[PDB]
Amino acid sequence: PSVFLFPPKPKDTLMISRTPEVTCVVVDVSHEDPEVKFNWYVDGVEVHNAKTKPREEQYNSTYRVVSVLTVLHQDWLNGKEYKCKVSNKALPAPIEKTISKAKGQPREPQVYTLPPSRDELTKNQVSLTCLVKGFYPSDIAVEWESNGQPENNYKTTPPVLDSDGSFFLYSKLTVDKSRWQQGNVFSCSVMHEALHNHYTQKSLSL
Amino acid sequence: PSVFLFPPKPKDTLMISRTPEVTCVVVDVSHEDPEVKFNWYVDGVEVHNAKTKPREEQYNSTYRVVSVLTVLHQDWLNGKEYKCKVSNKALPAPIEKTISKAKGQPREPQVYTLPPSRDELTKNQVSLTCLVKGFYPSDIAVEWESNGQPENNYKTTPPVLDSDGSFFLYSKLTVDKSRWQQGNVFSCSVMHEALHNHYTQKSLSL
Ligand SMILES: *[C@@H]1O[C@H](CO[C@@H]2O[C@@H](C)[C@@H](O)[C@@H](O)[C@@H]2O)[C@@H](O[C@@H]2O[C@H](CO)[C@@H](O[C@@H]3O[C@H](CO[C@H]4O[C@H](CO)[C@@H](O)[C@H](O)[C@@H]4O[C@@H]4O[C@H](CO)[C@@H](O[C@@H]5O[C@H](CO)[C@H](O)[C@H](O)[C@H]5O)[C@H](O)[C@H]4NC(C)=O)[C@@H](O)[C@H](O[C@H]4O[C@H](CO)[C@@H](O)[C@H](O)[C@@H]4O)[C@@H]3O)[C@H](O)[C@H]2NC(C)=O)[C@H](O)[C@H]1NC(C)=O
Ligand SMILES: *[C@@H]1O[C@H](CO[C@@H]2O[C@@H](C)[C@@H](O)[C@@H](O)[C@@H]2O)[C@@H](O[C@@H]2O[C@H](CO)[C@@H](O[C@@H]3O[C@H](CO[C@H]4O[C@H](CO)[C@@H](O)[C@H](O)[C@@H]4O[C@@H]4O[C@H](CO)[C@@H](O[C@@H]5O[C@H](CO)[C@H](O)[C@H](O)[C@H]5O)[C@H](O)[C@H]4NC(C)=O)[C@@H](O)[C@H](O[C@H]4O[C@H](CO)[C@@H](O)[C@H](O)[C@@H]4O)[C@@H]3O)[C@H](O)[C@H]2NC(C)=O)[C@H](O)[C@H]1NC(C)=O
Ligand SMILES: [Zn+2]
Numbered sequence A, B: 001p002s003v004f005l006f007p008p009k010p011k012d013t014l015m016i017s018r019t020p021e022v023t024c025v026v027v028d029v030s031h032e033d034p035e036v037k038f039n040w041y042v043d044g045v046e047v048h049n050a051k052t053k054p055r056e057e058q059y060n061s062t063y064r065v066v067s068v069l070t071v072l073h074q075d076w077l078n079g080k081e082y083k084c085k086v087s088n089k090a091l092p093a094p095i096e097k098t099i100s101k102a103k104g105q106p107r108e109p110q111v112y113t114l115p116p117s118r119d120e121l122t123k124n125q126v127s128l129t130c131l132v133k134g135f136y137p138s139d140i141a142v143e144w145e146s147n148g149q150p151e152n153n154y155k156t157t158p159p160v161l162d163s164d165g166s167f168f169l170y171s172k173l174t175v176d177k178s179r180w181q182q183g184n185v186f187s188c189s190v191m192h193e194a195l196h197n198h199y200t201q202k203s204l205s206l
């Protein structure tokens, strides 16, 4: 009987319109003692609005049971701590797990767009680069757009720990050299808790 | 009794002056049966030049024993396969492990240097960017230099799998804006099997 507690999707925590939730998973629940109760606490205060899912038997003759607690946008960003306690007759004592947003003084990213290198304008496609640096904590989302439509031919590196303790990354959008030279506007779009409204946008053009 | 087989350091495989080696580690060797023999094979042909280290007792009442086989620069790059076989009276059968250089058609990186973004020239330090794209396999080394001396105030992202099946990364070197504007030459230095002599260099200046 082991317990895992998973945080919300990072994007769900950064957009007020979404519903972040924390997920408490119990595995290796017995057939002989399959009863399980969850208790949830927010900063140690018990709360009662979680949603537990019906048990599901696994192929290795164990049960798996899940409970989902919605968290408030502001509670998560303000560092509230979420505890999941799992009780079962087979355990000597209940199992407790706690989770919160990544801790530490927040730092606002600086977003910089970089045009193709001169040497790359030989090729048929060119790389449009978005540098995002100086942010803390590392939870971040990055996407690209042009003319009110997503540009999805991109890849983004994981966050990399920089020498001052902040994080940076780069996102690379690949476009036809014709579109670059035709003058279209491309935008690097960044979501991070420390931005105003957790959002900023930076453009790139010839 | 478990066996782990480790490849050479990537940089040791890319510089003919260095000595790449493969390392075969055996852990959880008994006290009651601590005798261990290694056999090594290169493409299935037994070889006899390995160097086995004396057993070392661990704090959990087990032994750990290591054998080191040197590999030739060309053998490793040409995809030869190295097998480590570990025999012990406590096993029903010997344990065999095989390792080789990462497999797949090699692809030569393109190296591009990118100067600071216009918006960053406000700050006291600026970011010099080296994009390395299109390479396969992902083993790679990246460093920076200026005026025949290393510039070590840099960070490099891990390789990221690109949508064509090749890899890319970015390396970010941070320098005083004064040095950038004084006109110094900075060089992104890249080692990868698919380059000529597994080496190339690209420069960056105002
Ligand atoms: C008997 O079987 C059960 C059932 O599982 C088997 O499952 C697979 C393999 C099948 O093929 C069959 O063989 C079986 O049915 C076994 O249960 C497993 O026990 C493992 C421990 O022994 C446990 O390992 C731990 O996994 C953690 C990762 O879990 C992730 O990722 C795995 C895949 O990598 C995935 O299977 C899980 O479902 C889970 O996926 C995430 O789930 C969360 C919660 O739902 C998601 O979060 C939500 O996402 C939504 C959107 O999707 C939304 O954003 C919500 O807001 C958000 O909350 C999240 O998105 C999911 N991610 C993905 C990518 O899907 C590890 O973290 C953990 O690691 C710790 O382990 C070590 C410490 O001991 C350390 O290395 C380290 O510290 C790690 O932190 C464990 O590895 C398995 O997860 C668990 N399987 C399941 C399905 O629960 C059981 O073990 C077996 N018993 C025996 C005796 O064999
Ligand atoms: C009893 O104790 C022993 C001894 O260890 C204890 O060790 C530590 C923890 C102490 O604090 C004490 O508690 C004990 O003394 C236990 O032995 C351990 O068993 C583990 C398995 O149960 C095994 O795990 C496997 O580790 C692999 C990684 O090994 C790396 O990294 C670890 C740290 O992460 C490091 O400790 C190892 O030494 C090894 O380090 C690399 O070694 C290679 C070879 O030397 C280096 O390569 C060479 O490098 C040089 C330059 O340095 C040169 O370039 C050469 O050319 C090159 O060949 C390499 O540089 C080293 N790297 C670093 C960063 O140092 C994992 O890969 C492996 O993973 C597989 O595991 C799973 C599959 O089952 C999967 O997740 C996955 O597929 C993984 O691939 C395992 O996790 C430990 O390594 C092993 N410890 C040692 C020291 O050998 C024993 O278990 C314990 N028994 C019991 C019952 O408790
Ligand atoms: Zn309740």
Ligand SMILES: [Zn+2]
Binding pocket: A081, A098
């Ligand atoms: Zn706490």
Ligand SMILES: [Zn+2]
Binding pocket: A016, A073, A077, A197, A198
């Ligand atoms: Zn908010």
Ligand SMILES: [Zn+2]
Binding pocket: B047, B048, B049
């Ligand atoms: Zn021999």
Ligand SMILES: [Zn+2]
Binding pocket: B081, B098
């Ligand atoms: Zn083979």
Ligand SMILES: [Zn+2]
Binding pocket: B016, B073, B077, B197, B198
């Ligand atoms: Zn060579």
